[PDB]
Design a protein around this ligand. Structure first.
Ligand SMILES: [Mn+2]
Ligand SMILES: [Mn+2]
Lengths: 327, 327
């Protein structure tokens, strides 16, 4: 069996993960699920958002499925669970796919996930606060390679988004992205981070594989979300050399926690990207979701009246029906 | 007389500045205009995008009116004219006002303009590229004060946009913004840079005085632009303690240069913000623009068939008619 660590988190985390696990169970019986706590509770109790011993099982698992975690601003010494797991497990590539769920058109974003303004060199001293945006040859290269494989796989091009005009690290990063895309015969279109925000809302579907630095990607990927109607249908993968973690792009949504209305599609489609990572199909889940939305009542964030459970059952329904054409 | 340095720049720069100067001349005869070259030509010839001796007249003028400048990516040692003038003239506050020109609703952005990722400490060394995001007590304070005056003046609040969760400099900056807004009894709403991109496209009009770091503001202010239909209607002021510079938010647009179709409204309304800065009215220009757009054919970037000249004349028309109610 494939062993998959599951980390529901908190807020709506549990609800949408329950959704995504049940859908996985409905397409494959080849995966064992092991549940771990994580978040402020774990921190309050142990000093870390994840326990050391759990982190050691987690890192030896085949893949991780992650819900969402509340990172409270006013809790000293506390670091985000997802940011922590990203660095601990070596997850340098973040891939976010925003779908127009009717047409099947996609915005594809590759966010560098290990460095940039997330590298973590910051300090205050004598009324001077500083954060170091670090781009590194190995970091630029590996994420460039990752982005070219996504380009190749789609017969498409790379839109590298930057502020190389102002940021010496983006000048460096651009160079490297262009070399590897050269080595591999992939086209690289320039885009500048400020004007690209306009192109992204007005002409979403024409940019191929978007690649950018960590924080830039964080920003762009939330913006791209407007073209899917809700952030809560968007999935992601966080990939490293020996493992990967899958989570919906959305967050804790603590205000609607436990009310039965959260959108599970983000988690579910993240479950799909997980099956792909293991070499199971995922296509079935994607087809099932697409199949369901043609006439299914959706969640309130999408404008519908449906409960979380109606969507979950609805999609499982499509999956059971889909099973019988391995053919 | 008021002495105003005018820097047309290049690309569509000249065209829209010609527009904005003529409109100014039509509302006040109390301003002398002095023209200076700037951009790559000046660089190629002298090593600097602005000549030292001109920069010395410019800095002793009462205000600056600036068109737009082409900053070519592949020109070694060349720094942006506008970025250069921002630092040389001490222009730490950038104010961008995006208008819905029918309703009169506004998005108000205060971008810190002297530091952050624009401070200019960057380096590469042994495959390691770095840029230092610097926030400084004096920089945080002065821009916070500037933002509270814009809040007070509007009987409104401040939306401080950040990534304090990840960026130690934004934690520092937040603190300072909250203290001064406290001293002054102004409300400060938190917003996070990634999710705020969603709020900004979906609920543009409800955020009061948006304040952020330099690069964040650069990014947000281009995005806000989608709610005005074209970037080319949006004006800005760059303010420092002894002087200010006014420029449309848009850029060179070299591809449509010299074709007669550029939108001058951005420059014109920037001319308005200039009159306000001198203590002339500006209201007249704003009223004239609003007056003109109710039935005037607009430029191609707004979907119309009008030439640059039709809009310029049209607005002057409204101004001449407006003059006779000092009353
Ligand atoms: Mn984010
Ligand atoms: Mn910009």
């Amino acid at each position: 069996m494939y062993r998959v660590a599951v980390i529901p988190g908190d807020g709506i985390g549990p609800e949408v993960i329950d959704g995504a696990v049940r859908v996985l169970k409905a397409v494959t019986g080849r995966v064992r699920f092991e549940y771990y706590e994580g978040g402020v509770d774990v921190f309050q109790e142990c000093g870390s958002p994840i326990r050391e011993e759990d982190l050691e099982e987690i890192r030896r698992s085949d893949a991780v499925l992650f819900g969402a975690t509340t990172t409270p601003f006013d809790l000293p010494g506390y670091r985000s669970l997802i940011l922590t797991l990203r660095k601990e497990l070596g997850l340098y590539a973040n891939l976010r796919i925003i779908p127009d769920l009717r047409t099947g058109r996609e915005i594809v974003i590759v966010r560098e996930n290990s460095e940039g303004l997330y590298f973590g060199i910051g300090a205050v001293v004598n009324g001077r606060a500083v954060d170091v945006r670090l781009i590194t040859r190995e970091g630029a290269e590996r994420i460039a390679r990752f982005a070219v494989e996504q380009a190749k796989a789609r017969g498409s091009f790379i839109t590298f988004v930057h502020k190389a005009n102002v940021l010496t690290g983006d000048k460096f990063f651009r160079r490297i992205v262009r070399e590897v895309a050269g080595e591999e015969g992939v086209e690289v279109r320039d885009a500048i981070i400020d004007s690209f925000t306009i192109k992204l809302v007005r002409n979403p579907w024409e940019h191929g594989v978007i690649l950018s630095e960590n924080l830039f990607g964080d920003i762009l990927s939330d913006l791209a979300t407007v073209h899917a109607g809700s952030i809560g249908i968007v999935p992601s993968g966080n990939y490293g050399d020996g493992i990967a973690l899958f989570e919906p792009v959305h967050g804790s949504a603590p205000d609607i926690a436990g009310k039965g209305i959260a959108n599970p599609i983000g988690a579910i489609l993240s479950g799909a990207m997980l099956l792909d990572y293991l070499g199971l199909d995922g296509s079935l889940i994607r087809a099932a979701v697409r199949g369901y939305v043609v006439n299914g009542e959706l969640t309130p964030d999408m404008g519908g009246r449906a409960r979380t459970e109606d969507v979950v059952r609805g999609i499982i329904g499509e999956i059971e029906d889909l099973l019988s054409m391995d053919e």
